[PDB]
Structure of Polymerase acidic protein:
Amino acid sequence: IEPFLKTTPRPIRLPDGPPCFQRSKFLLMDALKLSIEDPSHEGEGIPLYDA
Amino acid sequence: IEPFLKTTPRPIRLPDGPPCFQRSKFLLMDALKLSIEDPSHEGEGIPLYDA
């Protein structure tokens, strides 16, 4: 055994190399949405036509 | 000539026979309308689907 001392754990070094790049299937902050402006309640829609 | 006197013109006699019957292409007082409840302004509709 050893004393897992206060000053012992060094800061974990992150890898270095090229910059990290996004891989999400859909962007998250920069996206925006073209509203429909509140259709009726009985009118169902096959989604293409609403789009 | 003759004097078209005040008392001369008898009341025109309407014909007599069976009762008069409607022939309009669409009834007029008794009809009613199933509303759509105010759709949007951009959504055009081929009329069957609105009906």
Summary: The first helix of chain B runs from residue 47 to 50. Chain B touches chain A through eight residues (CB under 8 Å). Residues 38 and 50 of chain B are 11 Å apart (CA to CA).
